Design a protein around this ligand. Structure first.
Ligand SMILES: Nc1nc2c(ncn2[C@@H]2O[C@H](COP(=O)(O)OP(=O)(O)OP(=O)(O)O)[C@@H](O)[C@H]2O)c(=O)[nH]1
Ligand SMILES: Nc1nc2c(ncn2[C@@H]2O[C@H](COP(=O)(O)OP(=O)(O)O)[C@@H](O)[C@H]2O)c(=O)[nH]1
Ligand SMILES: [Mg+2]
Lengths: 431, 48, 432
């Protein structure tokens, strides 16, 4: 019944996967061994003959290090060994190595494992793909896998949770190249993609959680909370829900304009105890503050095409509508002329769950706003400009060419990005 | 007199329902056509 | 003319349909087990129009429950009167329509349609004299809208001589669950213009406005809106389910209401307006009930009747009242408001009085109008449609299902022709 398969690619994807699955277990009362003493959780967890609950997920990395930590870790019994796939040689922050050279060896094995999970599904909805834009595996292997998934799965829904690179935490000079190459190749294969800018997450951890030097552990716990908010509607049956198809129908007006901006609230530090309880009005107001965004950009300089508000916990429809009405009186929120109905609201009964010993405080109510704004084009522009700086001099190009890539693939990828930026511009013009 | 009034009637109701199904059957021939097209374009997509 | 076969399609269709069955079962003195426990012979006189008599004292709704999604069906079974329905009459898919008319009409809906027709054929062949069909659905969704109109076309193919009646709920931005509602509605209106004999235009714009403005409900729920729908559905079907002279069957109603084949979209009205909780109320006399016929505040379609002309009107008064007073009041309204009735259709207002009032009220009035003002509802849909279609917004959801742009252009043009047709008769004169 309505199953969803989660694929975690590369270090970023695997590490975010660890955070997501830890949070899902806390939310559904599943122990780290898969034991549990609704029924919708079955969309994400299958059940074995021993009454154990197993994530409907595949973890893939071209290097074994990251995944070796999962198979030694607290949740080693949660996953069956066959769903934790590792190679020997990494993609060395090279899209060409991930996509071609190294990727081509493991691709068939990864798809065989995905096929085995799909065979356990009676009503497979589709896939959730987690990866970084910057790493060779996250970029190169993901686009290779996405292409192969379109072939094997027909017209099956594929949603992404993409880690947009940040210099505060960046590991490679070539991340703009890998980002553009993966976006070009994956664009025609993805139905909806939620970008997560590591700088936005880094700044929220610093500002809201008072963490001087945020680590991936800090970043992922926060990321996991947003992913859980998007997936709560699939894993639970509330008063107001949204399936794989309804997300896309409400937020995606055109094929290529499939990049919603996520905004989450409240993000409160586990200290204090006075900084709560926030009302529905207060958390809704926080969604329109650029400081709570998952991608750095300015919506006041762009136009909205769709706004989805996903509430969780002690929330009443009357409270929500009152909050939306006051926000509508703040003229500053501009929508495209071809869009009337701006607000689609969903309420899921379960209050946000937090990891014990975590940085996040337990709240009675939270909200995740998914908005399709033309302001997200600003994130593409930043990436495209960094690509252009290096590409004008063909700096580092030899690394890709050496692996069998052609220079033409770089031109093609960049022209496609130029067309994407042009698409966001065309969409914001009035008729 | 009546024969060539009720026969001329039975003909004028068979027609007003012939023109019905005939013109609301191509309303299934077209729903087959764009429906074949529905997975045809989806297939030749995977051809690329 | 005896039996009516009822069909409920989609979320809205099933929700409104379930409420219709609990309201009419209470009026006919039928409990959730199917047993008659009333104390009036009028309740059973025409019971066969909506119920089949099963072995013994039990009555079973001649209702078919349809959805491409299973959840709604479970909610119906769990409901107050959920157990009254024929178990074999629940026909549900597993793969929903996702608020996409194309999925409901061409893909998923087409796959389930035959299983539904099998159940409708069973009910139809049991009939001594089948009047026709009654469908409840929304036009803004995918199942109710797309599959509902597909069912209309398939049923029409097998039963071309039976009356096809619908209770079609119009979408509104005020109570919208999807941005594509103008597309789904336009594609459905195109189907209804061609395939139904009579359609009750139940507008969510009007229901929301009544709840918010009149009933003073700050945040209306579907439960609040459905209370107005069920009051209307009970009122407009009074003539079919109780002994009477006027509009006693679906064909006689159509013959009296439909002067031109395509102009079969009715504007329903109801007085007094009540909220679910409001079991007060102490009010409503005959002149008061009659005055609300021209009252835009009492219309279930968001149109002002004074912005057009009535081609035909059926008015049903319910409760213990003077038939003399009703006749005087009704004649007064036509004489005073001469300008809002077409002069080329003589004696175009027909009145009926039923002694049995609906539940909670001692006195009520239901209006069924065939007004040229209904063009306001269709114009609203066309303008919402064009705002989206001009930019080809969300078109990929439909073309992705195998649909062509031409179908969109055709549906829109057909609906604009309907508006133009209403305008033509609004401006027509008895100058001869
Ligand atoms: N949020 C977050 N970002 C991460 C994490 N790990 C890496 N990243 C980011 O992802 C990019 C680096 O790519 P990786 O995922 O580490 O690399 P990879 O996919 O394993 O690929 P290769 O090592 O080259 O084979 C940089 O932008 C990092 O900041 C993580 O746990 N969380
Ligand atoms: N009055 C009323 N409208 C409803 C109800 N449920 C949904 N709607 C409306 O129906 C449209 C959505 O269609 P829906 O019936 O949910 O989709 P379906 O399941 O695919 O037929 C919108 O215009 C909604 O506002 C209900 O119970 N009552
Ligand atoms: Mg790595």
């Amino acid at each position: 019944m309505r199953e969803c398969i989660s694929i975690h690619v590369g270090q970023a994807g695997v590490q975010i996967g660890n955070a997501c699955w830890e949070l899902y277990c806390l939310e559904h009362g599943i122990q780290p061994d898969g034991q549990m003493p609704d029924d919708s959780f079955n969309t994400f967890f299958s059940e074995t003959g021993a009454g154990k609950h197993v994530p409907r997920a595949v973890f893939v990395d071209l290097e074994p290090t990251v995944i070796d930590e999962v198979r030694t870790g607290t949740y080693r019994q949660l996953f069956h060994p066959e769903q934790l796939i590792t190679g020997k040689e990494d993609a060395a922050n090279n899209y060409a190595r991930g996509h071609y050279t190294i990727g081509k060896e493991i691709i068939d094995l990864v798809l065989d494992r995905i096929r085995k999970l799909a065979d356990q599904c009676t009503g497979l909805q589709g896939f959730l793909v987690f990866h970084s834009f910057g790493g060779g595996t996250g970029s190169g292997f993901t686009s290779l896998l996405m292409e192969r998934l379109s072939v094997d799965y027909g017209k099956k829904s594929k949603l992404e949770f993409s880690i947009y690179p940040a210099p505060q935490v960046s590991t490679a000079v070539v991340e703009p190249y890998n980002s553009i190459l993966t976006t070009h190749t994956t664009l025609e294969h993805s139905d909806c993609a939620f970008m997560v800018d590591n700088e936005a997450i880094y700044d929220i951890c610093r500002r809201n959680l008072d963490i001087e030097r945020p680590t991936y552990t800090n970043l992922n716990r926060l990321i996991s909370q947003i992913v859980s908010s998007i997936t709560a509607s699939l894993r639970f049956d509330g008063a107001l829900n949204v399936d794989l198809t309804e997300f896309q129908t409400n937020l995606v007006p055109y094929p290529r304009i499939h990049f919603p901006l996520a905004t989450y609230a409240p993000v409160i530090s586990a200290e204090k105890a006075y900084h709560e309880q926030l009302s529905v009005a207060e958390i809704t107001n926080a969604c329109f503050e650029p400081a709570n965004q998952m991608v750095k950009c300015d919506p006041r300089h762009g136009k909205y095409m769709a706004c989805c508000l996903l509430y969780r916990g002690d929330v009443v429809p009357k409270d929500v509508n009152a909050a939306i009405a006051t926000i509508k009186t703040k003229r500053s929120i501009q929508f495209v002329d071809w869009c009337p109905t701006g607000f689609k609201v969903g309420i899921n009964y379960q209050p946000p769950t937090v990891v014990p010993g975590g940085d996040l405080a337990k709240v009675q109510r939270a909200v995740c706003m998914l908005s399709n704004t033309t302001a997200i084009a600003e994130a593409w522009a930043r990436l495209d400009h960094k690509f252009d700086l290096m590409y004008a001099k063909r700096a580092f190009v030899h690394w890709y060419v050496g692996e069998g890539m052609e220079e033409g693939e770089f031109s093609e990828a960049r022209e496609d990005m130029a067309a994407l930026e042009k698409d966001y511009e065309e969409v914001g013009v009035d008729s | 007199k009546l024969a060539q009034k009720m026969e001329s009637n039975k003909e004028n109701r068979e027609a007003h329902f012939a023109a019905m199904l005939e013109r609301l059957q191509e309303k299934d021939k077209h729903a087959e056509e764009v429906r074949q097209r529905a997975i045809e374009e989806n297939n030749n997509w995977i051809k690329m | 003319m005896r039996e009516i076969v009822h069909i409920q399609a989609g979320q809205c269709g099933n929700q409104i349909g379930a409420k219709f069955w609990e309201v009419i079962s209470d009026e006919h003195g039928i409990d959730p087990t199917g047993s008659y426990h009333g104390d009036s012979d009028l309740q059973l006189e025409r019971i066969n129009v909506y119920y089949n008599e099963a072995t013994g004292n039990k009555y079973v709704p001649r209702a078919i429950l349809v959805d491409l999604e299973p959840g709604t069906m479970d909610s119906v079974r769990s409901g107050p009167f959920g157990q009254i329905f024929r178990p074999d009459n629940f026909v549900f898919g597993q793969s929903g329509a996702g608020n996409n008319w194309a999925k409901g009409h061409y893909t998923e809906g087409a796959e389930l349609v035959d299983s539904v027709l099998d159940v409708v054929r069973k009910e139809s062949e049991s009939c001594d004299c089948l009047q026709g069909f009654q469908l409840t659905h929304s036009l803004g969704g995918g199942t109710g809208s797309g599959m509902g109109t597909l069912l209309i076309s398939k049923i029409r193919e097998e039963y071309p001589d039976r009356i096809m009646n619908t209770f079609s709920v119009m979408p509104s931005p005020k109570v919208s669950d999807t941005v594509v509602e103008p597309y789904n509605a336009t594609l459905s209106v195109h189907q209804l213009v061609e395939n139904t004999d009579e359609t009750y235009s139940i507008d969510n714009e009007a229901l929301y406005d009544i709840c918010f403005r009149t009933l003073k409900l700050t945040t209306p729920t579907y439960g609040d809106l459905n209370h107005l729908v069920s009051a209307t559905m009970s009122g407009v079907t009074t003539c079919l389910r109780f002994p009477g002279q006027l509009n006693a069957d679906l064909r006689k109603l159509a013959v009296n209401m439909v002067p031109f084949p395509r102009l079969h979209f009715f504007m329903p009205g109801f007085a007094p307006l009540t909220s679910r909780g409001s079991q007060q109320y102490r009010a409503l006399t005959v002149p008061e009930l009659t005055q609300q016929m021209f009252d835009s505040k009492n219309m279930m379609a968001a149109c002002d009747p004074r912005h057009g002309r009535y081609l035909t009107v059926a008015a049903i008064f319910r409760g213990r009242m003077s038939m003399k007073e009703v006749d005087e009041q009704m004649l007064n309204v036509q004489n005073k408001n001469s300008s809002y009735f077409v002069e080329w259709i003589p004696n175009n207002v027909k009145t009926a009085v039923c002694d049995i009032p609906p539940r909670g009220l001692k006195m009520s009035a239901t209006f069924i109008g065939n007004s040229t003002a209904i063009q306001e509802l269709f114009k609203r849909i066309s303008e919402q449609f064009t705002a989206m279609f001009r930019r080809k917004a969300f078109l990929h959801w439909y073309t992705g299902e195998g649909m062509d742009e031409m179908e969109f252009t055709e549906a829109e043009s057909n609906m604009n022709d309907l508006v133009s047709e209403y305008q033509q008769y609004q401006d027509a004169t008895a100058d001869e």
